[PDB]
Ligand binder design. Sequence first.
Ligand SMILES: CCCCNC(=O)c1cc(S(N)(=O)=O)c(Cl)cc1SCCc1ccccc1
Ligand SMILES: CCCCNC(=O)c1cc(S(N)(=O)=O)c(Cl)cc1SCCc1ccccc1
Ligand SMILES: [Zn+2]
Ligand SMILES: [Zn+2]
Lengths: 251, 251
Amino acid sequence: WRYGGDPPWPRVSPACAGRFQSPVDIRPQLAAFSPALRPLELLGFQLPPLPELRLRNNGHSVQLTLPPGLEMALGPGREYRALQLHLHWGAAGRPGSEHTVEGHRFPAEIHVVHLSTAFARVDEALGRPGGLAVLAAFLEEGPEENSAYEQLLSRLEEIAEEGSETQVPGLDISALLPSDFSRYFQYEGSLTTPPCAQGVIWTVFNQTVMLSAKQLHTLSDTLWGPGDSRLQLNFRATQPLNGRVIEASFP
Amino acid sequence: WRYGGDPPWPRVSPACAGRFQSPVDIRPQLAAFSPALRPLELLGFQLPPLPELRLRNNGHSVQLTLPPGLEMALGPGREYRALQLHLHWGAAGRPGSEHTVEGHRFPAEIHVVHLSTAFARVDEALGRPGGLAVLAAFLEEGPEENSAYEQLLSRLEEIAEEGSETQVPGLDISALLPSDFSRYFQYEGSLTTPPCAQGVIWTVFNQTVMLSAKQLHTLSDTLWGPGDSRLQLNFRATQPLNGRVIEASFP
Ligand SMILES: CCCCNC(=O)c1cc(S(N)(=O)=O)c(Cl)cc1SCCc1ccccc1
Ligand SMILES: CCCCNC(=O)c1cc(S(N)(=O)=O)c(Cl)cc1SCCc1ccccc1
Ligand SMILES: [Zn+2]
Ligand SMILES: [Zn+2]
């Protein structure tokens, strides 16, 4: 499978034709204020330099594989472990966030993928309610350089070739996300890639994260994908809510 | 294991000492109104008179086995099939509901136990979040005989001995539940019996169902339990919310 053409995702995984797919257009107007939604709690995200983490050009994104010990709670009794993070981005002044807000696409998006503590493996969790949870943040153009993002972006050069990887030092993974853990949208959706399994709890932060133009350019212009093609516009088209209600943690 | 006697439950099933157990004290004023909670959908619940259904004294409750085909939705793509229903009740002047509202215990409680359609078997769903869903309604005293409940309470005679069972005509299962399916409390919790597995989505109807004082009496005073002693007070004490916010479908 690939972005921008065949093989039609459904022929790959039938679940890519489910009613309740991701990503979606967030309309904060139509969101439901749900005061049950307490602030997110991350444990063990402040990693030391050793051991090193694998960073991979898998042809679809750049993926940072995360070690055991990153614990995430969406609430009391809603416990997850981080597996990996990856990025979706566009090209030169064409934005590439997967989620949009009142139809606005942001320059790029980060996903931190998590497995419910009730499952030993991802393949058991696919399609199961709340089996995976994604924490999602938009990246916008800002004046300053994001020093946290610079540690990953300075290594893209080394994995330019599709299917290539490198080892990088541990870092503050929670410094790749916004500081406001209390203001977010939450909804039930799917993977945005095949096999597109449903049952995924998406949390999407109100606050964005700022990268410099050089940084956004480095993300969009450095990696190569399937064929002699640049790895760009690595986002799926927005999917109708089909009667899902997005919750908001704030009025 | 037994109700009222011994042994401490955490000694049969350490899971009974989890942080996120059921049943709980509902405080409607501390509940969080979430507009995302849609009306419950129950299809296939109007059973014909044949086939007949197994009704069984299992020593802990009276339990009706439900056939395949009772489909239930808590929200879009969040579907369930009904397995069984059973009751909790008090005795001669003591109320015996499991859930309580602002401390008030009601005479009795009906639990309709469902399996998520994302799992083939109950044993796979146990401990998984949303794996099992219970529809719970308080039974209280009113002036009229309840036609729906009479179909069950009149057959208790024939199964008074622990372990005895009987076949009963098909009935309308939706007729044992309250009037307004848009009005409920919901929280994540546990089985209220061993093994006290967590991940159970509890939905408690705001509105109650009315049984004649004769009928409650038939329910509390007909059945024989473990030993040469009566099947009565078959409820678990209220359990702490431990940070869990009970949600409401209504302001
Ligand atoms: C086979 C590699 C495909 C690349 N996709 C993902 O890494 C991926 C993306 C998302 S997203 N964009 O919804 O946030 C999510 Cl939630 C998970 C994964 S990978 C884990 C899921 C999976 C299991 C088995 C095969 C393929 C994917
Ligand atoms: C072995 C004792 C059986 C008595 N309890 C139940 O049938 C039962 C009660 C509840 S409750 N009060 O939370 O609604 C629920 Cl949600 C399920 C069951 S039976 C299905 C789960 C189970 C599997 C294996 C052993 C025991 C229970
Ligand atoms: Zn993604
Ligand atoms: Zn019960």
